[PDB]
Symmetry: D2
Subunit: 154 residues, 4 copies
Amino acid sequence: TQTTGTSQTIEVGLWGGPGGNAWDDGSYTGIREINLSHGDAIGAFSVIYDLNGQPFTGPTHPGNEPSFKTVKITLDFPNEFLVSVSGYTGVLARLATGKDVIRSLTFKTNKKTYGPYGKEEGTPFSLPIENGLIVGFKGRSGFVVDAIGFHLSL
Amino acid sequence: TQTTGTSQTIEVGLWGGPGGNAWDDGSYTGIREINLSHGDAIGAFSVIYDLNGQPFTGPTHPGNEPSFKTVKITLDFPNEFLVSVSGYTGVLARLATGKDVIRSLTFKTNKKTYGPYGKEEGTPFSLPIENGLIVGFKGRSGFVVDAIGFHLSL
Amino acid sequence: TQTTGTSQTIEVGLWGGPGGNAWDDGSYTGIREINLSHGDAIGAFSVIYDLNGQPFTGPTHPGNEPSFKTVKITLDFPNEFLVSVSGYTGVLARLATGKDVIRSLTFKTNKKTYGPYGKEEGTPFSLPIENGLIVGFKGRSGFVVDAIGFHLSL
Amino acid sequence: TQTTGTSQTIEVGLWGGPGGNAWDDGSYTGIREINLSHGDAIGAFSVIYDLNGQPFTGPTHPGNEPSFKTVKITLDFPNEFLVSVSGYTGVLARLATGKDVIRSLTFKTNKKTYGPYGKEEGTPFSLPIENGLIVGFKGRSGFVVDAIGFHLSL
Ligand SMILES: OC[C@H]1O[C@H](O)[C@@H](O)[C@@H](O)[C@@H]1O
Ligand SMILES: OC[C@H]1O[C@H](O)[C@@H](O)[C@@H](O)[C@@H]1O
Ligand SMILES: OC[C@H]1O[C@H](O)[C@@H](O)[C@@H](O)[C@@H]1O
């Protein structure tokens, strides 16, 4: 029985720690571009989604670490799409929190692999996808990316 | 196995005739407002969708009947949502095509009923929903709304 | 946020009256065969669903009209599937209920059309499908099929 | 547009190695009971799924480990359901294959945590779920569980 007016999607995650502040881009129809920054961890994470055949810039999550290396991943949408997302979660000493954050991220599409970005240290995690698509990102950010999760759809 | 980068939704319809030009707004996360015009049939039809908590103006489908009366259905989103859409499909004498067009439309939410709009003549049709939501509209339009269909999602 | 252990599917309908007793076959992987009976209305209705590549006999809804013509619709699963279900709802005088029942049903697959079964009198209804599949039937039955609805899935 | 009569679900995984023989239980509407055996790895793995309110015995994947202790996880379905499945993948010396297998598994429902089962050695993996349900299991098995994956649905 329907009890709310907002549609929903399957959501997996989050991988990472409880620090930072929660954010959720919601869901769209695909992924066109990913902009992130990295160093000893993943700092910024912002996405340009596809919305019914046209680009749609999602809310930004730059974090507050200005010294990281910036990276732009432009996917050959719609022929190229993610088939796997993996990374590492662990404590970053200079944060003085003792709580896990996203240390590294790797993006694998049906065409190639982007990454690893950041530092592969801590506990690894991976989300291989056999059927379906990531149609949205969610997570937690403070100084850097604390945690990440994904909205999935057929 | 995934073979495309564009996600999908269930699609039902179309109800109505083969006339006019086909249109499809695509899919979103909900419905915020519906703007239509009616006389001896449904003329204009445009929707303001919800996209992850923010309104998104969908493509317009004004048709071409300057004499029709305009109507604005502003839903109390997300608390209020459609639980049924019904209407009538039939020929319009002045079109002299022998083909059906959307003569009438009635929108029923969990809070109230809007309509009927237009003229309830021809063959009735209806889409009562028990679980899930309409997250997008599609159809065909010329001078009036020739046909209509819906994208559905949980 | 998940709150129950039972998965769900989009559900449309019901079309028909409030008489008889409610039933819901639930959802499966597809439809292999439909067995029904018809005369001046639709009497018995039971389905052989597909459950992950193997047939699964669904709950029976025999009704109580022994005089009806019995029909078996064996689909060439999985290449053949329903793209539309339509019919008529209305009062059947002899039932002495004054409530609408399923007077007629027509099943259209991508290969051919089965029916019309029963009597095409009353109010028509139709569910044409552009994307997705009927993966389960639900409704209400007494001596005949009082109402019917469908579970949809990609 | 629909082009096949077989419905589908999102599928994630597999986690583990390439050894053993592939299997896929397919999808259902829930999980009632999980049966497995464990020692220095996960040996047997079977499930009693829910299929529209009734139990459905899933295909068996006993592997072949006489010394492994057997566990029967009977969930308080439908109120109790998995919110996370995690474990470890890695080589098991005695198998003499040099390929990764499922060394350990932990099941976390909204009520309690079951496990860890087996030995937490090798590379960890985890599937936390925020929205949706695991409605089917798939993987590869030989003497033990070589790999595992999941079918997800709302
Ligand atoms: O983002 C990493 C870290 O940044 C700051 O130290 C704070 O916002 C923490 O709460 C957060 O965990
Ligand atoms: O099925 C038609 C009719 O059969 C019986 O008379 C009863 O079960 C009614 O409630 C039902 O409407
Ligand atoms: O299951 C572990 C192992 O068992 C046997 O040795 C074979 O079936 C292998 O292919 C498999 O990897």
